[PDB]
Design a binder for this molecule. Structure first.
Ligand code: 0U4
Length: 374
């Protein structure tokens, strides 16, 4: 397709985050940047760190402009402190443009960088509302759209076990099968969506849909897990246990505190259930559902003869987070121009001969507006 040079522009090292190459400054300094739809700051390591092999050297960039302002960003996991400035930025396997963007130079950090992950910075792709220090700091994608012809849309295919594609300015049809189904972006801060029903192996969890979105639900490539509010998590685990009852696992397995390992190639995927989230559709009273497999929610942990797994659905107190566990099933289109997020079955998603991830619709769901928290 026309976007062929952007295909396979993502990498990941042992499932520690999906990253794209970005080139900053003049002369060029290329760094590996984690793609994060769950935050809105573009920040790069800019000083030595034990887990960094490279970092941004501002003094070597003739085009660097100091903003004379500090910045601090805490995440659910980790935090960093740094210094704001602007510089020229291109994505060599992305759009054919160069923009002047805000960049946070990370000088100190706590549990942010990940040993062996091979990434050295983060690209926050969400909206200005959640940027630090405040919403006046234009996020990267906003700058790209304001300064260039590039359409206000990007799409992500995260390929689990690895790699994937970030298509910028459009969609590449080779990256998915079947149809794309869209859910509204409820509000432009996080990529906020509304979940209207949850099923485990076709069985309705039967919770009030308000519980699924308390206090928000977001699509977040920078978060590994499917994170669920406590009440929802507990109900989900109870149902998943019931569905997989032909095998018993320690309580701590469901809490992510214990791993279970199988002999290489023998993992009984079939004994674990599929999980479906229904999302609000584009038409009144219309929904669709996305369905993931245990291959998505049971994550490998790297004897070479043993395949060890961690259960990667976990508890949150800050609403639902549809992280990599969800996104790895799908090609996800962040259609900012039309304030909607599209899902289609990923051409690269991990499955088996018996089951596949699915995106299906339409369904009829009433009173979906009520599901959202106010
Ligand atoms: C890079 C790595 N990410 C993580 O290991 C990870 C990052 C995060 C995380 O915070 N990611 C942020 C970006 C990041 C951080 C650190 C290293 C690399 C990337 C995202 O930006 C978070 N997105 C926003 C989440 C909301 C934040 C605000 N809050 C509400 C709140 C709470 C307190 C105070 C104010 C507001 C709700 C959730 C979280 C978590 N979890 C808590 S978990 C075990 O359930 O999966 C795991 C990864 C590995 C594989 C695939 C994708 C990503």
């Amino acid at each position: 397709g026309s976007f062929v040079e952007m295909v396979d522009n993502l990498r990941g090292k042992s499932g520690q985050g999906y990253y794209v190459e970005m080139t900053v400054g003049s002369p060029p300094q290329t760094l590996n940047i984690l793609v994060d739809t769950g935050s809105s700051n573009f920040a790069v390591g800019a000083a030595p760190h034990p887990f960094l092999h490279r970092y941004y050297q501002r003094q070597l960039s003739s085009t660097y402009r100091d903003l004379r302002k500090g910045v601090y960003v805490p995440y659910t996991q980790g935090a960093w402190a740094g210094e704001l400035g602007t510089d020229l930025v291109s994505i060599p396997h992305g759009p054919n443009v160069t923009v002047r963007a805000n960049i946070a130079a990370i000088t100190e950090s706590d549990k942010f960088f990940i040993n062996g992950s091979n990434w050295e910075g983060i690209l926050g792709l969400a909206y200005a509302e959640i940027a630090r220090p405040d919403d006046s700091l234009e996020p990267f994608f906003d700058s790209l759209v304001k300064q260039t012809h590039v359409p206000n849309l990007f799409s992500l295919q995260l390929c689990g076990a690895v790699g994937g594609s970030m298509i910028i300015g459009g969609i590449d049809h080779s990256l998915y099968t079947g149809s794309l189904w869209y859910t509204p972006i409820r509000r432009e801060w996080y990529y906020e969506v509304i979940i209207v029903r949850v099923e485990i192996n076709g069985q309705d969890l039967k919770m009030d849909c308000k519980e699924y979105n308390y206090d928000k639900s977001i699509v977040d490539s920078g978060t590994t897990n499917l994170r669920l509010p406590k009440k929802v998590f507990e109900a989900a685990v109870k149902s998943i246990k019931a569905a997989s009852s032909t095998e018993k696992f320690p309580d701590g397995f469901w809490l992510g505190e214990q791993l279970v390992c199988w002999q290489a190639g023998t993992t009984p995927w079939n004994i674990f259930p599929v999980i479906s989230l229904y999302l609000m559709g584009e038409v009144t009273n219309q929904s669709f559902r996305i369905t993931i497999l245990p291959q998505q929610y049971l994550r490998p942990v790297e004897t070479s003869q043993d395949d060890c797994y961690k259960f990667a659905i976990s508890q949150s107190s800050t609403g639902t987070v549809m992280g990599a566990v969800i996104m790895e099933g799908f090609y996800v289109v962040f259609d900012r121009a039309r304030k909607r997020i599209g899902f289609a079955v990923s051409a690269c998603h991990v499955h088996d001969e018996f089951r596949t991830a699915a995106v299906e619709g339409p369904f009829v769901t009433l009173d979906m507006e009520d599901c959202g928290y106010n």
